[PDB]
Assembly symmetry: C3
Homo-oligomer: 118 residues x 3
């Protein structure tokens, strides 16, 4: 899978980025059984002030995780995975989980290429 | 919902970013009935020259809005919402709406976490 | 369609960005029959060190192509298109295709606006 993680510049130090990537990657392996190296976490940083909630400009605390997954998992499993990402990123980023948004999009495996192969 | 708004650096001043966020957020509330604070607008800025149309490098005017929505709305309603975003962002960004692209992706509610809850 | 291309800053020169955009755009026209000017390629650059694979921080070689398409094409056609993007971006970016990931998401045409029209 690919987890696009949208954060404000300077909110996550390199150590914190590694910790957040580990939290997400461990949650995905542990709950779905997929191998480690298949989980990409891709941080997309923007300057603070680019996030609006209800039209109101925010500081730099929002973390939006957009997970791009293969179709075929149960709703219960996807909910457990989203909840684990919230809990574990809250620990890893030392952040109130009110700041964490997680959306999963799914795709047929036949239109997903990882490491240059299907 | 989350609206990822892809723009070129310097095309939108902070005032214009606030106006565009307000246009999108107001359109989403008004047409779907969802509450204000649930609408995130997340601006993703890149240097001018990173956008190609038909292989041709563009200036800094393209605005691509990628809305990430819960499934369950009618095609007519989604079309009205997309059209309103085009019209209202055209006003808010003082931009020819030939420059505005809007795509909506949808997801089951059970795999969407906002503010740390489902 | 819109192809969001996630790369590390400095991996692609402007010439290489043009070559990669041409590879993707030509593959989409040639295989699907859509017109040239309808294909947007939008490069999203981030500093090297923002990509993790299996929790391990990478250099600047990963290229993730997220294609946003209209629904309605066959699985075989989508697979041929993904494979062509891998091959042709490998040539255009002078890069081992082990570094190239390609995911396609699809949407009803009625919720896709390009150039300010449906």
């Amino acid at each position: 899978p690919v987890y696009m993680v949208y954060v404000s510049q300077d909110r996550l130090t390199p150590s914190a980025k590694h910790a957040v990537a580990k939290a997400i990657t461990d949650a995905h392996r542990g709950l779905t059984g997929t191998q480690h190296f298949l989980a990409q976490v891709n941080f997309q940083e923007q300057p603070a002030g680019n996030v609006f909630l209800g039209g109101v400009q925010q500081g730099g605390d929002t973390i939006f995780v957009h997970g791009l997954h293969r179709e075929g998992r149960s709703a219960d499993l996807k909910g457990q995975l989203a909840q684990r990402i919230v809990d574990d990123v809250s620990v890893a980023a030392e952040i109130d989980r009110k700041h964490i948004w997680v959306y999963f999009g799914e795709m047929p495996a036949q239109q997903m290429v990882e490491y240059g192969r299907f």
